Curated annotation (Swiss-Prot), chain A:
Function: Precursor of the fusion protein processed in the biosynthesis of the S protein and the formation of virus particle. Mediates fusion of the virion and cellular membranes by functioning as a class I viral fusion protein. Contains two viral fusion peptides that are unmasked after cleavage. The S2/S2' cleavage occurs during virus entry at the cell membrane by host TMPRSS2 or during endocytosis by host CSTL.
Organism annotation: Severe acute respiratory syndrome coronavirus 2
Designated name of the protein: Spike protein S2
Disulfide bridge map: C10-C32, C15-C21
Domain of life: Viruses
Curated annotation (Swiss-Prot), chain B:
Protein name (record): Spike protein S1
Species classification: Viruses, Riboviria, Orthornavirae, Pisuviricota, Pisoniviricetes
Function per UniProt: Attaches the virion to the cell membrane by interacting with host receptor, initiating the infection. The major receptor is host ACE2. When S2/S2' has been cleaved, binding to the receptor triggers direct fusion at the cell membrane. When S2/S2' has not been cleaved, binding to the receptor results in internalization of the virus by endocytosis using host TFRC and GRM2 and leading to fusion of the virion membrane with the host endosomal membrane. Alternatively, may use NRP1/NRP2 and integrin as entry receptors.
Subunit architecture: Binds to host ACE2. RBD also interacts with the N-linked glycan on 'Asn-90' of ACE2. Cleavage of S generates a polybasic C-terminal sequence on S1 that binds to host Neuropilin-1 (NRP1) and Neuropilin-2 (NRP2) receptors. Interacts with host integrin alpha-5/beta-1 (ITGA5:ITGB1) and with ACE2 in complex with integrin alpha-5/beta-1 (ITGA5:ITGB1). May interact via cytoplasmic c-terminus with M protein. May interact (via N-terminus) with host bilirubin and biliverdin, thereby preventing antibody binding to the SARS-CoV-2 spike NTD via an allosteric mechanism.
Record: glycosylation sites: N21, N34
Length: 48, 38
C-alpha cells in the first residue's frame, strides 16, 4: 500500500558543506529542485 | 586515541502556515531531530 517516505537533499548529497560546489550545482539549474519536488510528490502520493 | 566523526546538519526543516488570507503565523518543524536549538 505505502512505500517508505524518503526525502533526499540533493544539495547536501551532491555537495557537502561546500560553497563552490553549491554554486556549480546551481549552475545546472533546477535539477536539484526538480528531484526534491519529485521526492516530495512521491511522499505525498504514498500518504494519499 | 580513537575518535568518531558524525556529519552535522541532522534532518531537514518544514514550514507550517495557514492560508495567506487567514493569518501570517507560522510553525517550524525540524524533521527527525530533537529540540536542541529552539
Amino acid at each position: 500500500v505505502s512505500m517508505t517516505k524518503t526525502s533526499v537533499d540533493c544539495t547536501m548529497y551532491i555537495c557537502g558543506d561546500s560553497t563552490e560546489c553549491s554554486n556549480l550545482l546551481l549552475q545546472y539549474g533546477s535539477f536539484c529542485t526538480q528531484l526534491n519536488r519529485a521526492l516530495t510528490g512521491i511522499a505525498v502520493e504514498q500518504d494519499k | 586515541e580513537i575518535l568518531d566523526i558524525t556529519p552535522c546538519s541532522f534532518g531537514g526543516v518544514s514550514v507550517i502556515t495557514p492560508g495567506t488570507n487567514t493569518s501570517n503565523q507560522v510553525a517550524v518543524l525540524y524533521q527527525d531531530v530533537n529540540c536542541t536549538e529552539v
